[PDB]
């Protein structure tokens, strides 16, 4: 597919299950002006997937409080989504959700983000960070049996915000409050001494 | 490029700067039987890059002790690498290294991992986790101004090792010692009670 | 797609939800020697679909008693199927099933039977009658809002069986016990006096 | 051929034998505003075919009374049609007809409906339900030795009319007077508890 | 099409209505060793056509007695042929036939003799004279409204036979018993004195 | 070549030997408004050919009197034609001619009427009847050793003229004064009874 | 065409009119071991052409005495050739011939010698000198209205023979008995002094 | 190459050595209104070539006096030409020249006249006669060891001039003062009586 | 690549390390009106390369004083360049530079000058002399182990300036003050007497 | 063309003027085991060219004594070469030569070394250094008006010989007896200090 860093994120406009239980088209352009964490998962009613989806749903506010939305997506229909929502978490369900979930029934969205597993018809665990101008800035794809880390997605969004705001550059392992540096041969000396 | 999850990692055999200061060809097939974290950076003598490279070098043992090697790569010559190694960390140098650094002068390696930034001739911050059978299992690419997290690379390697060892599946945010589950509708019920 | 009357039905070998609740590959060649009614529906957890699926499941024996199996198929995963099976009929579920249901996640089966609705990613209400030599003998496709008739499927299977057994031809509206005729200019005269 | 559900039915304008014994061009666009049942048969002066053609002719009014026309078609010339019309039913003829019969001498119409049997030069038993906007809504194709059912064609036309009139969806085996349901997760509950 | 003088006549093997009222495949190679007059007509149950077909049937013996068979062909089915045969001549029928009539339902035979009228799907009035080695020696094609002349076909066959037998050449308007000449500058002088 | 019935005859404009012994271009469009019999022969100074050419020359008037011209054509130059004209008939010459003879030295005309015998560079005995609108209505091609019949050409022209004038159709063997019929199922009955 | 100096002359094998009035195939390979003057002319029964043909025929012996044959060729048939031969020279005929004349009816020979005038279908006045190994050594082509010179053809053949025999080179205007020179910088000095 | 009789001679515009010892571009269009004899030779400082070149130079006036120029051409540079001009004839030089000599260093001119000997990079002894409208009228090409005849070139130019002036045609061996004839069947008879 | 003599030098506009230690785009068009010596070297921090670069830097003024700039280029980044500049010459560094050094990180500039060594990703020792109209006048490429000569580059620039100023031509080994000659057959004689 | 550094030099086998005044084929493979300086010049009888050719001829021994041959080449014929050799140096000639000179009449050799000036048909001043294994090691091409330097060619050959013999690398301006260095980061320090 079609997703390249520092190019416009592949556009989409697709039916999604909204937090209030309704079906509505969600378009990438509706997130213009915001950061977006778009993430894919393979299949409704499975195993790693609800742990990830529920973690992002429970913690949406950590993202919304810094101007970042989150959006989930899989191959399943809206109706599968809705049904999965109607089962309690203790039975492997989702319960109530605070994030929308796209139903990529044609699989065109996952194809364009380059995360289709062709042999099975499902998405790999791709996560993408899209900025307010709608350009792609970070790509993460896990094989199916290993879940992603929500704290790391949050760290990345924060690091990217920081870079836009201050024109500085974020070192390895950067967390809010750590030292950063200007990407300049002379001014960077301040970072490297002590 | 042609790096796809669960397919053989694109093969390479290229000159590298070795820890002992010599130049030697390093071939992907040398790592057969081990896990490998292969990571790219844009340019010698810059800013984020030495913070990442030095972190992975300082912490190699955390990776070796669990059967995982680490390898770095950039567009620069082996002579640039060596020179950079000869400058102290407090002046923006690398100092002594415990990991090899490939010199991808033809750029064929970064092209094949899909992390060339064509307009500039440099690699994005791509990091790849390759398993002992030499298949690619995890892809991570950051835009240039935001550094990667070594603790997260380690978590992922561990999670993948855990999955291969026990046939179980690793939930969101999994750290060694957390609960896992069997990817089966019936047996997964045990997990969803907690 | 490539489903043509009197040619071999397009071959498939895909995961299915079996009546006993397990997952197993079901291959077209496993029905060699039997008649098969293969039928597609658009989406799990919807409206016309369970009324059809349940009718075929309740009445399997009418088909099995005369050497004819029945097989259902949709775009949804095995896991969606299983979940739907776990909801009671009076809540729009399937309950226990006596028929397998294929999970055509790659959509290759529906593509090959020519019943994909490309814009939505779902199958039209296609029903196919395949004979013991595995050749396709009857094609039926409804638009989504109108359900199929199980009595008419049964009539067709019986008519095709009757034709293979006796070398006669089945007139319009034929039911078991009605007059048939030999497809011969002279011998047909008997039928037409009436 | 190119007959697809919910696309415009393939257009035609061809010589037909009319009920009054004359020859006239009949164009698909003449049926705009009506439902149309278009049906093909292999050969004049054969066996299943007159039983089907006569049934549809005898019962045209059941179709006209509900705003649906019927049209027949085969590979034979107008002159064969006319001749067949001049033989009495008890000798295997058609007698007087109340429906037109197209003479698809070039075979372009059957090609475009996808019901040509290339090896023999004849049409399979294809039956198509076209709506007033001239979109195709139902496809039925039988192998040659098994006739179609007129009552089932009628049921389908009625079901489709019912759906257009009321915005409801017709379950399996639906006949006029049976319960229907709204294709909505919440409003469909009324159907399933009763 | 590909009928060329002095090349093998395009081969065919097709269902025909035989004089005795049965259906049988007739193959061009059956006529090896004989002369053949193959002739096409547009449509069963029409106007010029029966006058030609009946003339050739009545007069077959004039052709058989000199080692020449005759074969008719049209686009219509065997069943049309048979039906037409069952109507008396005074009602525009054929009555009993002494020649076989091919049913070129796929139209492949007329295509290959180059006498298809594409717009209508029917054959022009093509007549072809094929020799015992199965090479084509004479081509005649009339537009539909003008019938052919049987006496002229007979003249041509006789002329061609005469030429094979004696190595002489047949002048304009030659009839049995007229002067012929050797195709030699010197020996032809005998003809031209008269 | 590209001569097809009911299509414009292939156009030509070529040097011809005129009756008065001169050379002039003769163009197909010159014959607009007339019937034309165009006929080809293989070679000047040969055997069948002068018998045909002389017969058509002697009898031109039978054709002119009914609005039909005649034109001859061969591969030879105008100078060969002229020379052949200068030899008396009793020595195998043509003598004085009342018809023009085209000199198709490039062979483009015979190629386009489809009567070139490629291996020898000469025309077969092709004869074509072109109507006043310049459409081709009748094709006749004989192998070289058998001459054509002038009376039959005349019969055909007359039959075609008769059909244009009266809208009737000419049966097998029709001669002026024989019964004809209207090509209509009802009105044709009068021909077939008595 | 394909006639190139010092390459094999384009091969031919075609019907010719022989001196004794018979028709025979003449093949280029028949002249192996001899010199050959092959010459083309546009049309039998014309103007320049017989003056050339008759000159070469009258003077054959001047050529045959030095091991050189001569062969003529045009677009006309053998029968035109023969006829032209039968007219006396004083009436523009050829009379008796001592050279064969090819009849290049397909025009393949003139095409291959590159002397076809496409617009007219005739050969230009091409004359070719072919040596005993069958390689082409001299090309001469005149526009139609200017005849060739026989004495010059003879001079050329003699010059080429002289060159084969002695390994010397023939100056401008060379005639038998004139000075020649060795094609060597030193030995050529003898020619250039006195 | 693309030199064809009666087509425009291939155009050229190339450096030449002029008679006065200077270098100047000579363009074919400069000769418009004149006859031109263009002749090629293989190599400066060789053997046959100076005998030809010197003959044409010595006898230019025989050509100029009748409105015909002459132009020479070879693969050699203008400097080779000049040098050759500086050596006396008695040592194999050219001496003073009255004719320009083109230096076809790119070989494009000889390629276009079709007289390149590809294996050696030199021109064959091609001579071409171009008329005042710049059309090619006569082609002569000799293999390298045999020189051309200047008298024959002159004869040809004269013959062509004669034909353009009087509309008559020049027989074999024609010299000024010989009988010519009108190219007309009737008027040519006067030539053939003698 | 596409560098050809007397064609425009391939255009470039690329980041360079300037003498004052800054990074700036340098475009070929900046040198319009000057002579330019553009020279490539394989790799920063190597062996031959600094001896060449330092020689050209030390001696820039010898080039500037005569209207000629000099520009260096390699595959390495601007940061490698800057670093190399920061090491003293006696440790293998460059020290302060008086010439800019391009950083051809995409390798597009070396590709277009045809000096890429594809297998290694580095430039050969290519040196190019570009004139004030920006046309390429001199190409020099050494294999990697042999350095170029600065005095030769200077000699060439001077020779080319001399030629442009005086319209004379520079002999083998020419140094300022040596004899030159006019490129004219006559005027060159003065040079060759000595 | 296809001359590339460190690839086999383009092969040739062509007529040359040898030192003793004879013509002989000279093949590149004859120089296997020796160094070769191959050099091209534009045109015999010109201006810079003899100064270069004479200077290489006078100084051949400086090259032979160190195992290096020299070979010259131009577009002109052997005969031009020989002639130029016959003129004394004081008149712009070559006199006696000690070096062979190829006559690249087809221009295939200069094409393959990439030094053809297509518009003029002549070679640029290309000079190539080929090693004993026949690989190309140095390319030099001057525009026409500036001659090359023989001392620099000699310097280069010596430098390349030195490098092959000792495995060291030759700095800028290296002359026999100057300091060289080992191409190793550590061992090169000896060169850079003092």
mmCIF file with all atom_site columns, N, CA and C in Angstrom, chain G residues 68-107:
data_model
loop_
_atom_site.group_PDB
_atom_site.id
_atom_site.type_symbol
_atom_site.label_atom_id
_atom_site.label_alt_id
_atom_site.label_comp_id
_atom_site.label_asym_id
_atom_site.label_entity_id
_atom_site.label_seq_id
_atom_site.pdbx_PDB_ins_code
_atom_site.Cartn_x
_atom_site.Cartn_y
_atom_site.Cartn_z
_atom_site.occupancy
_atom_site.B_iso_or_equiv
_atom_site.pdbx_formal_charge
_atom_site.auth_seq_id
_atom_site.auth_comp_id
_atom_site.auth_asym_id
_atom_site.auth_atom_id
_atom_site.pdbx_PDB_model_num
ATOM 1   N N  . UNK G 1 68  ? 29.475 -15.721 -70.044 1.00 0.00 ? 68  UNK G N  1
ATOM 2   C CA . UNK G 1 68  ? 28.453 -14.912 -69.446 1.00 0.00 ? 68  UNK G CA 1
ATOM 3   C C  . UNK G 1 68  ? 27.114 -15.148 -70.123 1.00 0.00 ? 68  UNK G C  1
ATOM 4   N N  . UNK G 1 69  ? 26.104 -15.488 -69.329 1.00 0.00 ? 69  UNK G N  1
ATOM 5   C CA . UNK G 1 69  ? 24.758 -15.634 -69.826 1.00 0.00 ? 69  UNK G CA 1
ATOM 6   C C  . UNK G 1 69  ? 23.961 -14.329 -69.668 1.00 0.00 ? 69  UNK G C  1
ATOM 7   N N  . UNK G 1 70  ? 22.829 -14.250 -70.361 1.00 0.00 ? 70  UNK G N  1
ATOM 8   C CA . UNK G 1 70  ? 21.961 -13.155 -70.188 1.00 0.00 ? 70  UNK G CA 1
ATOM 9   C C  . UNK G 1 70  ? 20.531 -13.612 -70.076 1.00 0.00 ? 70  UNK G C  1
ATOM 10  N N  . UNK G 1 71  ? 19.828 -12.918 -69.186 1.00 0.00 ? 71  UNK G N  1
ATOM 11  C CA . UNK G 1 71  ? 18.474 -13.253 -68.815 1.00 0.00 ? 71  UNK G CA 1
ATOM 12  C C  . UNK G 1 71  ? 17.584 -12.002 -68.676 1.00 0.00 ? 71  UNK G C  1
ATOM 13  N N  . UNK G 1 72  ? 16.385 -12.024 -69.264 1.00 0.00 ? 72  UNK G N  1
ATOM 14  C CA . UNK G 1 72  ? 15.514 -10.864 -69.239 1.00 0.00 ? 72  UNK G CA 1
ATOM 15  C C  . UNK G 1 72  ? 14.300 -11.152 -68.386 1.00 0.00 ? 72  UNK G C  1
ATOM 16  N N  . UNK G 1 73  ? 13.611 -10.110 -67.937 1.00 0.00 ? 73  UNK G N  1
ATOM 17  C CA . UNK G 1 73  ? 12.529 -10.284 -66.982 1.00 0.00 ? 73  UNK G CA 1
ATOM 18  C C  . UNK G 1 73  ? 11.571 -9.103  -66.966 1.00 0.00 ? 73  UNK G C  1
ATOM 19  N N  . UNK G 1 74  ? 10.281 -9.401  -66.925 1.00 0.00 ? 74  UNK G N  1
ATOM 20  C CA . UNK G 1 74  ? 9.264  -8.387  -66.769 1.00 0.00 ? 74  UNK G CA 1
ATOM 21  C C  . UNK G 1 74  ? 8.044  -8.924  -66.025 1.00 0.00 ? 74  UNK G C  1
ATOM 22  N N  . UNK G 1 75  ? 7.100  -8.040  -65.810 1.00 0.00 ? 75  UNK G N  1
ATOM 23  C CA . UNK G 1 75  ? 5.907  -8.303  -65.035 1.00 0.00 ? 75  UNK G CA 1
ATOM 24  C C  . UNK G 1 75  ? 4.884  -9.184  -65.789 1.00 0.00 ? 75  UNK G C  1
ATOM 25  N N  . UNK G 1 76  ? 5.028  -9.271  -67.109 1.00 0.00 ? 76  UNK G N  1
ATOM 26  C CA . UNK G 1 76  ? 4.035  -9.899  -67.968 1.00 0.00 ? 76  UNK G CA 1
ATOM 27  C C  . UNK G 1 76  ? 4.059  -11.411 -67.865 1.00 0.00 ? 76  UNK G C  1
ATOM 28  N N  . UNK G 1 77  ? 2.951  -12.055 -68.225 1.00 0.00 ? 77  UNK G N  1
ATOM 29  C CA . UNK G 1 77  ? 2.906  -13.528 -68.283 1.00 0.00 ? 77  UNK G CA 1
ATOM 30  C C  . UNK G 1 77  ? 3.801  -14.118 -69.387 1.00 0.00 ? 77  UNK G C  1
ATOM 31  N N  . UNK G 1 78  ? 4.098  -15.416 -69.267 1.00 0.00 ? 78  UNK G N  1
ATOM 32  C CA . UNK G 1 78  ? 4.705  -16.199 -70.358 1.00 0.00 ? 78  UNK G CA 1
ATOM 33  C C  . UNK G 1 78  ? 3.940  -16.094 -71.663 1.00 0.00 ? 78  UNK G C  1
ATOM 34  N N  . UNK G 1 79  ? 2.612  -16.046 -71.566 1.00 0.00 ? 79  UNK G N  1
ATOM 35  C CA . UNK G 1 79  ? 1.762  -16.024 -72.740 1.00 0.00 ? 79  UNK G CA 1
ATOM 36  C C  . UNK G 1 79  ? 1.878  -14.682 -73.481 1.00 0.00 ? 79  UNK G C  1
ATOM 37  N N  . UNK G 1 80  ? 1.943  -13.561 -72.754 1.00 0.00 ? 80  UNK G N  1
ATOM 38  C CA . UNK G 1 80  ? 2.314  -12.273 -73.376 1.00 0.00 ? 80  UNK G CA 1
ATOM 39  C C  . UNK G 1 80  ? 3.699  -12.353 -74.041 1.00 0.00 ? 80  UNK G C  1
ATOM 40  N N  . UNK G 1 81  ? 4.685  -12.932 -73.355 1.00 0.00 ? 81  UNK G N  1
ATOM 41  C CA . UNK G 1 81  ? 6.011  -13.081 -73.926 1.00 0.00 ? 81  UNK G CA 1
ATOM 42  C C  . UNK G 1 81  ? 5.962  -13.837 -75.237 1.00 0.00 ? 81  UNK G C  1
ATOM 43  N N  . UNK G 1 82  ? 5.319  -14.998 -75.206 1.00 0.00 ? 82  UNK G N  1
ATOM 44  C CA . UNK G 1 82  ? 5.203  -15.848 -76.376 1.00 0.00 ? 82  UNK G CA 1
ATOM 45  C C  . UNK G 1 82  ? 4.533  -15.095 -77.516 1.00 0.00 ? 82  UNK G C  1
ATOM 46  N N  . UNK G 1 83  ? 3.436  -14.420 -77.210 1.00 0.00 ? 83  UNK G N  1
ATOM 47  C CA . UNK G 1 83  ? 2.726  -13.662 -78.228 1.00 0.00 ? 83  UNK G CA 1
ATOM 48  C C  . UNK G 1 83  ? 3.632  -12.611 -78.874 1.00 0.00 ? 83  UNK G C  1
ATOM 49  N N  . UNK G 1 84  ? 4.457  -11.964 -78.062 1.00 0.00 ? 84  UNK G N  1
ATOM 50  C CA . UNK G 1 84  ? 5.239  -10.824 -78.513 1.00 0.00 ? 84  UNK G CA 1
ATOM 51  C C  . UNK G 1 84  ? 6.328  -11.308 -79.453 1.00 0.00 ? 84  UNK G C  1
ATOM 52  N N  . UNK G 1 85  ? 6.838  -12.467 -79.107 1.00 0.00 ? 85  UNK G N  1
ATOM 53  C CA . UNK G 1 85  ? 7.745  -13.277 -79.912 1.00 0.00 ? 85  UNK G CA 1
ATOM 54  C C  . UNK G 1 85  ? 7.200  -13.659 -81.288 1.00 0.00 ? 85  UNK G C  1
ATOM 55  N N  . UNK G 1 86  ? 5.890  -13.776 -81.396 1.00 0.00 ? 86  UNK G N  1
ATOM 56  C CA . UNK G 1 86  ? 5.222  -14.146 -82.630 1.00 0.00 ? 86  UNK G CA 1
ATOM 57  C C  . UNK G 1 86  ? 4.943  -13.021 -83.577 1.00 0.00 ? 86  UNK G C  1
ATOM 58  N N  . UNK G 1 87  ? 5.271  -11.805 -83.193 1.00 0.00 ? 87  UNK G N  1
ATOM 59  C CA . UNK G 1 87  ? 5.118  -10.662 -84.052 1.00 0.00 ? 87  UNK G CA 1
ATOM 60  C C  . UNK G 1 87  ? 6.510  -10.262 -84.556 1.00 0.00 ? 87  UNK G C  1
ATOM 61  N N  . UNK G 1 88  ? 6.601  -9.864  -85.826 1.00 0.00 ? 88  UNK G N  1
ATOM 62  C CA . UNK G 1 88  ? 7.891  -9.525  -86.465 1.00 0.00 ? 88  UNK G CA 1
ATOM 63  C C  . UNK G 1 88  ? 8.437  -8.205  -85.920 1.00 0.00 ? 88  UNK G C  1
ATOM 64  N N  . UNK G 1 89  ? 9.742  -8.038  -85.997 1.00 0.00 ? 89  UNK G N  1
ATOM 65  C CA . UNK G 1 89  ? 10.369 -6.860  -85.413 1.00 0.00 ? 89  UNK G CA 1
ATOM 66  C C  . UNK G 1 89  ? 9.886  -5.583  -86.051 1.00 0.00 ? 89  UNK G C  1
ATOM 67  N N  . UNK G 1 90  ? 9.604  -5.645  -87.348 1.00 0.00 ? 90  UNK G N  1
ATOM 68  C CA . UNK G 1 90  ? 9.218  -4.441  -88.077 1.00 0.00 ? 90  UNK G CA 1
ATOM 69  C C  . UNK G 1 90  ? 7.821  -3.951  -87.666 1.00 0.00 ? 90  UNK G C  1
ATOM 70  N N  . UNK G 1 91  ? 7.038  -4.798  -86.999 1.00 0.00 ? 91  UNK G N  1
ATOM 71  C CA . UNK G 1 91  ? 5.780  -4.358  -86.366 1.00 0.00 ? 91  UNK G CA 1
ATOM 72  C C  . UNK G 1 91  ? 5.874  -4.140  -84.849 1.00 0.00 ? 91  UNK G C  1
ATOM 73  N N  . UNK G 1 92  ? 7.081  -4.008  -84.307 1.00 0.00 ? 92  UNK G N  1
ATOM 74  C CA . UNK G 1 92  ? 7.260  -3.759  -82.872 1.00 0.00 ? 92  UNK G CA 1
ATOM 75  C C  . UNK G 1 92  ? 7.261  -5.035  -82.034 1.00 0.00 ? 92  UNK G C  1
ATOM 76  N N  . UNK G 1 93  ? 7.491  -6.171  -82.693 1.00 0.00 ? 93  UNK G N  1
ATOM 77  C CA . UNK G 1 93  ? 7.595  -7.445  -82.015 1.00 0.00 ? 93  UNK G CA 1
ATOM 78  C C  . UNK G 1 93  ? 9.021  -7.787  -81.684 1.00 0.00 ? 93  UNK G C  1
ATOM 79  N N  . UNK G 1 94  ? 9.203  -8.941  -81.105 1.00 0.00 ? 94  UNK G N  1
ATOM 80  C CA . UNK G 1 94  ? 10.510 -9.445  -80.772 1.00 0.00 ? 94  UNK G CA 1
ATOM 81  C C  . UNK G 1 94  ? 11.084 -10.389 -81.832 1.00 0.00 ? 94  UNK G C  1
ATOM 82  N N  . UNK G 1 95  ? 10.208 -11.095 -82.538 1.00 0.00 ? 95  UNK G N  1
ATOM 83  C CA . UNK G 1 95  ? 10.641 -12.231 -83.325 1.00 0.00 ? 95  UNK G CA 1
ATOM 84  C C  . UNK G 1 95  ? 11.281 -13.337 -82.481 1.00 0.00 ? 95  UNK G C  1
ATOM 85  N N  . UNK G 1 96  ? 12.064 -14.191 -83.128 1.00 0.00 ? 96  UNK G N  1
ATOM 86  C CA . UNK G 1 96  ? 12.795 -15.245 -82.447 1.00 0.00 ? 96  UNK G CA 1
ATOM 87  C C  . UNK G 1 96  ? 13.773 -14.645 -81.465 1.00 0.00 ? 96  UNK G C  1
ATOM 88  N N  . UNK G 1 97  ? 13.845 -15.260 -80.285 1.00 0.00 ? 97  UNK G N  1
ATOM 89  C CA . UNK G 1 97  ? 14.757 -14.866 -79.207 1.00 0.00 ? 97  UNK G CA 1
ATOM 90  C C  . UNK G 1 97  ? 15.840 -15.918 -78.936 1.00 0.00 ? 97  UNK G C  1
ATOM 91  N N  . UNK G 1 98  ? 17.047 -15.457 -78.618 1.00 0.00 ? 98  UNK G N  1
ATOM 92  C CA . UNK G 1 98  ? 18.145 -16.335 -78.141 1.00 0.00 ? 98  UNK G CA 1
ATOM 93  C C  . UNK G 1 98  ? 18.410 -16.261 -76.648 1.00 0.00 ? 98  UNK G C  1
ATOM 94  N N  . UNK G 1 99  ? 17.551 -15.561 -75.919 1.00 0.00 ? 99  UNK G N  1
ATOM 95  C CA . UNK G 1 99  ? 17.653 -15.500 -74.488 1.00 0.00 ? 99  UNK G CA 1
ATOM 96  C C  . UNK G 1 99  ? 16.317 -15.847 -73.848 1.00 0.00 ? 99  UNK G C  1
ATOM 97  N N  . UNK G 1 100 ? 16.357 -16.475 -72.682 1.00 0.00 ? 100 UNK G N  1
ATOM 98  C CA . UNK G 1 100 ? 15.097 -16.663 -71.964 1.00 0.00 ? 100 UNK G CA 1
ATOM 99  C C  . UNK G 1 100 ? 14.543 -15.360 -71.412 1.00 0.00 ? 100 UNK G C  1
ATOM 100 N N  . UNK G 1 101 ? 13.232 -15.300 -71.256 1.00 0.00 ? 101 UNK G N  1
ATOM 101 C CA . UNK G 1 101 ? 12.571 -14.156 -70.616 1.00 0.00 ? 101 UNK G CA 1
ATOM 102 C C  . UNK G 1 101 ? 11.675 -14.612 -69.474 1.00 0.00 ? 101 UNK G C  1
ATOM 103 N N  . UNK G 1 102 ? 12.053 -14.280 -68.246 1.00 0.00 ? 102 UNK G N  1
ATOM 104 C CA . UNK G 1 102 ? 11.246 -14.621 -67.070 1.00 0.00 ? 102 UNK G CA 1
ATOM 105 C C  . UNK G 1 102 ? 9.904  -13.889 -67.063 1.00 0.00 ? 102 UNK G C  1
ATOM 106 N N  . UNK G 1 103 ? 8.878  -14.547 -66.542 1.00 0.00 ? 103 UNK G N  1
ATOM 107 C CA . UNK G 1 103 ? 7.577  -13.934 -66.327 1.00 0.00 ? 103 UNK G CA 1
ATOM 108 C C  . UNK G 1 103 ? 7.319  -13.779 -64.845 1.00 0.00 ? 103 UNK G C  1
ATOM 109 N N  . UNK G 1 104 ? 7.643  -12.614 -64.312 1.00 0.00 ? 104 UNK G N  1
ATOM 110 C CA . UNK G 1 104 ? 7.588  -12.349 -62.879 1.00 0.00 ? 104 UNK G CA 1
ATOM 111 C C  . UNK G 1 104 ? 6.190  -11.904 -62.491 1.00 0.00 ? 104 UNK G C  1
ATOM 112 N N  . UNK G 1 105 ? 5.221  -12.807 -62.630 1.00 0.00 ? 105 UNK G N  1
ATOM 113 C CA . UNK G 1 105 ? 3.813  -12.467 -62.431 1.00 0.00 ? 105 UNK G CA 1
ATOM 114 C C  . UNK G 1 105 ? 3.482  -12.070 -61.015 1.00 0.00 ? 105 UNK G C  1
ATOM 115 N N  . UNK G 1 106 ? 4.175  -12.613 -60.015 1.00 0.00 ? 106 UNK G N  1
ATOM 116 C CA . UNK G 1 106 ? 3.914  -12.208 -58.626 1.00 0.00 ? 106 UNK G CA 1
ATOM 117 C C  . UNK G 1 106 ? 4.666  -10.963 -58.278 1.00 0.00 ? 106 UNK G C  1
ATOM 118 N N  . UNK G 1 107 ? 5.602  -10.557 -59.136 1.00 0.00 ? 107 UNK G N  1
ATOM 119 C CA . UNK G 1 107 ? 6.466  -9.377  -58.940 1.00 0.00 ? 107 UNK G CA 1
ATOM 120 C C  . UNK G 1 107 ? 7.462  -9.550  -57.813 1.00 0.00 ? 107 UNK G C  1
#
